[PDB]
Amino acid sequence: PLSFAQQRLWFIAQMSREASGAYHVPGGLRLRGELDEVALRAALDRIMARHEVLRTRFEWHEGEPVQCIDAEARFPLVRQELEGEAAELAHWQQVEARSPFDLGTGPLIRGRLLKQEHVLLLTMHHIVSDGWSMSVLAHELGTLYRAYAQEPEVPALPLQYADYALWQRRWLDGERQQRQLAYWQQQLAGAPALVSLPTDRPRPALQDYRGDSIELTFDAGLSQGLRALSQRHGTTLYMTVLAAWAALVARLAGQPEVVIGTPVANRQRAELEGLIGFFVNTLALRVDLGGEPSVAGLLAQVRERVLAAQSHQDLPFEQVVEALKPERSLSHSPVFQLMLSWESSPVRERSAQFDLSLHLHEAADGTVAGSLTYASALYERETVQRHAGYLKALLAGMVADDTQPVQRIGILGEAERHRLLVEWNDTAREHPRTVCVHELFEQQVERSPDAVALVYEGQQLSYRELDRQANRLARQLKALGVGPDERVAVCTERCLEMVVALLAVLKAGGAYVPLDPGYPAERLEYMLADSAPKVLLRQSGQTLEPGAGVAVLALDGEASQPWQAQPAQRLSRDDSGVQPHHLAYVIYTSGSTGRPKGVMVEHAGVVNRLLWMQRAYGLQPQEAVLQKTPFGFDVSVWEFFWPLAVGARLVMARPQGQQDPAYLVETIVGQDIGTLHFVPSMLQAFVDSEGVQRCRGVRRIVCSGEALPGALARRLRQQLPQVELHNLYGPTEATVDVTAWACDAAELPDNIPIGRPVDNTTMYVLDAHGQPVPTGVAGEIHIGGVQVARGYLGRPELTRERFVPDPYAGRPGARLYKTGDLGRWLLDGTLEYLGRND
Numbered sequence: 088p089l090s091f092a093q094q095r096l097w098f099i100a101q102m103s104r105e106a107s108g109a110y111h112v113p114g115g116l117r118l119r120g121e122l123d124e125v126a127l128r129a130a131l132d133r134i135m136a137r138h139e140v141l142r143t144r145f146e147w148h149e150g151e152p153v154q155c156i157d158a159e160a161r162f163p164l165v166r167q168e169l170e171g172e173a174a175e176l177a178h179w180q181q182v183e184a185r186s187p188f189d190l191g192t193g194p195l196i197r198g199r200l201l202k203q204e205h206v207l208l209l210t211m212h213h214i215v216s217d218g219w220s221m222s223v224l225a226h227e228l229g230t231l232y233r234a235y236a237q238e239p240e241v242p243a244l245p246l247q248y249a250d251y252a253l254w255q256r257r258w259l260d261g262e263r264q265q266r267q268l269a270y271w272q273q274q275l276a277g278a279p280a281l282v283s284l285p286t287d288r289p290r291p292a293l294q295d296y297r298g299d300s301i302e303l304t305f306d307a308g309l310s311q312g313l314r315a316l317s318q319r320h321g322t323t324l325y326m327t328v329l330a331a332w333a334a335l336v337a338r339l340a341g342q343p344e345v346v347i348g349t350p351v352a353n354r355q356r357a358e359l360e361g362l363i364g365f366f367v368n369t370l371a372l373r374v375d376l377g378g379e380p381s382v383a384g385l386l387a388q389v390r391e392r393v394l395a396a397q398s399h400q401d402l403p404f405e406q407v408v409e410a411l412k413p414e415r416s417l418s419h420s421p422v423f424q425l426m427l428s429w430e431s432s433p434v435r436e437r438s439a440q441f442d443l444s445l446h447l448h449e450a451a452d453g454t455v456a457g458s459l460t461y462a463s464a465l466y467e468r469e470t471v472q473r474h475a476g477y478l479k480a481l482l483a484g485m486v487a488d489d490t491q492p493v494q495r496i497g498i499l500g501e502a503e504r505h506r507l508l509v510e511w512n513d514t515a516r517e518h519p520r521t522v523c524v525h526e527l528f529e530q531q532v533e534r535s536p537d538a539v540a541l542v543y544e545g546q547q548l549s550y551r552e553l554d555r556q557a558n559r560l561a562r563q564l565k566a567l568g569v570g571p572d573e574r575v576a577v578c579t580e581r582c583l584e585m586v587v588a589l590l591a592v593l594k595a596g597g598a599y600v601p602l603d604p605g606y607p608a609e610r611l612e613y614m615l616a617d618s619a620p621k622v623l624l625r626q627s628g629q630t631l632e633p634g635a636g637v638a639v640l641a642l643d644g645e646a647s648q649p650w651q652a653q654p655a656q657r658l659s660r661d662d663s664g665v666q667p668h669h670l671a672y673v674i675y676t677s678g679s680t681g682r683p684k685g686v687m688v689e690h691a692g693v694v695n696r697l698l699w700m701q702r703a704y705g706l707q708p709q710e711a712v713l714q715k716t717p718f719g720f721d722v723s724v725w726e727f728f729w730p731l732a733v734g735a736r737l738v739m740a741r742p743q744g745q746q747d748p749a750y751l752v753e754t755i756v757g758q759d760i761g762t763l764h765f766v767p768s769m770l771q772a773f774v775d776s777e778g779v780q781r782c783r784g785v786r787r788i789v790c791s792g793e794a795l796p797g798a799l800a801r802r803l804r805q806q807l808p809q810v811e812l813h814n815l816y817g818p819t820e821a822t823v824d825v826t827a828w829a830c831d832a833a834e835l836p837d838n839i840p841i842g843r844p845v846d847n848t849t850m851y852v853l854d855a856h857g858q859p860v861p862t863g864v865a866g867e868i869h870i871g872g873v874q875v876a877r878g879y880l881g882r883p884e885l886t887r888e889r890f891v892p893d894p895y896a897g898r899p900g901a902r903l904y905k906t907g908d909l910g911r912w913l914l915d916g917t918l919e920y921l922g923r924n925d
């Protein structure tokens with residue numbers, strides 16, 4: 088656990104170390120033949136004196152750096168002889184390119200050799216070489232050894248690198264540099280500053296240069312098909328791969344435009360092709376994927392922008408970045424974060440200057456091979472391998488049909504597709520298919536009839552007492568026409584009679600409609616008329632009048648005494664006639680602006696939601712739950728019926744009690760509350776409230792409704808180290824909650840996942856065309872399974888738009904709910920909430 092200054096200074100110190108080796112040009116060469124250590128010195132010294140760059144040093148001389156060219160050129164070759172094989176070669180080769188040079192005075196190109204089988208290692212500094220110059224140096228060394236092996240004084244160089252540098256000084260000052268600057272500032276203006284590729288970990292504040300790589304090859308079949316495809320469109324094999332990778336990245340990142348950089352040799356004139364020195368320049372290629380282009384159309388755009396880029400390749404890329412004046416970040420590279428390098432007809436790269444670096448070359452077999460180098464801090468290895476699979480899949484689709492929309496080509500492999508759709512939705516759990524919500528309570532009454540069921544301000548009802556009260560009212564409801572799918576509105580503040588009413592409606596075979604008296608009269612009257620209930624159960628004191636032939640029964644007070652004359656025996660299953668597919672409640676949701684919609688929720692889904700909750704958290708009969716949520720919110724559904732189904736007691740909070748910080752803590756302590764709910768905003772008030780640390784008896788805090796910030800979860804641990812924090816997600820249209828995540832990791836992330844689907848529930852992250860997206864890609868959350876509600880009461884058109892057929896359940900008639908929520912799968916099979924679709 089380092090401090091902030093130490094962690095910063097560590098990343099600052101280790102950034103320089105890994106980047107210190109990134110300014111070298113290594114190269115290996117195995118020498119087979121006769122042991123000819125005599126014919127090697129003249130071939131190495133002649134090549135040194137041939138290129139005045141290799142024997143050039145640099146000094147300070149009053150304000151600016153200057154070049155100090157020397158006369159004689161001697162080669163600094165260290166000699167050894169190793170016993171161990173693989174482990175020894177990798178160690179000597181690593182420190183060969185890792186041991187720094189002396190740019191001040193001394194050599195800048197080293198060498199090591201050891202043994203009729205030798206190994207000539209060569210390493211140059213980037214200020215006097217590059218990738219092209221390394222192969223030219225080995226090209227020259229092979230000829231000079233051959234001329235020695237047959238024959239002294241071994242074609243002369245046509246131009247000096249200082250002549251190139253002197254020409255560049257005038258060109259940078261000329262008006263051709265100003266035109267090339269004007270084009271690049273035009274081409275890259277307003278381009279996206281940072282690619283939003285899905286990362287397995289959040290981006291570090293300081294760019295971590297730790298890298299790794301994977302190997303990828305295109306077989307001869309795909310390689311030939313890409314050659315033929317590119318021939319049809321007048322593009323090179325590089326333009327085709329560039330077009331594919333950009334389309335893939337734009338699709339994965341959810342961005343319309345993608346900027347990909349490419350190292351260019353920058354030896355335009357045929358005069359500098361044999362020269363050694365720093366010549367590479369970088370070009371930033373802005374590829375647009377908007378408008379759903381076709382494979383042919385995208386290839387035409389890339390072909391034009393690559394040709395336009397290669398015409399303006401003299402301008403140094405540093406002057407492009409300086410002109411664009413971007414918000415330079417310490418966390419990512421400027422202008423682009425992805426590089427594609429292409430070699431034509433080395434050690435494993437562990438340094439990552441960019442997020443992804445795709446290196447590809449054309450092999451001898453006609454196949455295309457290379458590597459994909461990734462930043463270890465951002466991506467796991469399996470993510471990068473899936474990324475490489477997408478590219479190969481996208482390339483194959485471009486060959487199979489170059490007229491289709493490029494952004495709709497299938498890229499998912501069958502393994503990942505089956506994992507997303509099936510494996511991560513393996514939630515089937517057998518439950519009694521004929522049990523209704525109230526029957527869960529009735530089964531518990533028989534097990535513990537004298538146990539405490541309800542507590543409200545010094546009043547108590549046992550399980551038997553509560554069941555008999557509900558039976559009496561349920562028989563009165565039956566006498567007023569309450570039955571399957573019929574609604575019973577309930578208007579009351581919290582009290583014992585609130586739970587009597589809810590249980591009585593379910594026992595009578597109907598569905599309850601909660602009417603919170605705190606809402607405006609106009610709102611209550613709309614819901615009362617929209618639901619068209621048979622009966623209105625009303626607390627004494629409430630003045631809500633339905634008219635319209637609706638029967639009004641008093642819920643408490645002297646006016647409720649008549650239905651106490653009803654027998655307290657239970658109604659038979661044939662008397663109420665209710666079944667799990669019948670409605671249990673209609674709870675109105677606002678959604679946005681306009682009239683609220685009544686969500687019709689059936690018994691079977693509620694039973695499944697309650698049975699899962701007990702399996703996951705194991706509420707015991709001696710525990711207490713706090714009823715603090717307004718009963719017009721469906722979170723109250725499990726507050727009511729979870730403890731009553733398992734034997735625990737439900738403590739009804741004082742009306743508007745959760746808004747008093749003193750009352751909440753005092754009630755938690757005074758009543759031994761073990762489980763309660765918070766929306767994240769009110770959990771913040773709880774952890775900031777006086778005396779929250781007194782609540783060490785709390786067992787479970789369930790959080791839902793809003794995004795749960797990781798900092799709040801971590802803050803709750805410091806205040807109540809014993810409490811289990813659980814993040815639950817779900818809309819009303821899918822029965823309260825459909826995913827859950829326990830916040831029990833030793834280190835909690837800033838984005839707390841919403842978790843994994845609950846029992847008999849499926850989750851899908853789909854694109855605009857209803858197709859599953861790769862792991863980590865954002866898409867719209869769709870919910871399947873038994874908890875999907877029946878629909879919106881009296882809104883068949885809206886029901887049809889949001890409750891769509893389920894093509895993935897493998898059973899006819901199944902339906903999905905389109906949530907309007909954005910989410911993504913994490914690589915560990917957990918879901919992450921990202922926001923609203925609009």
Ligand SMILES: Nc1ncnc2c1ncn2[C@@H]1O[C@H](COP(=O)(O)O)[C@@H](O)[C@H]1O
Binds near residue numbers: 908920
């Ligand atoms: N754990 C959660 N994290 C983020 N948003 C949530 C969570 N739970 C619920 N929501 C949001 O609340 C909506 C449902 O609210 P409601 O239907 O009023 O219960 C969801 O569609 C989400 O937008």
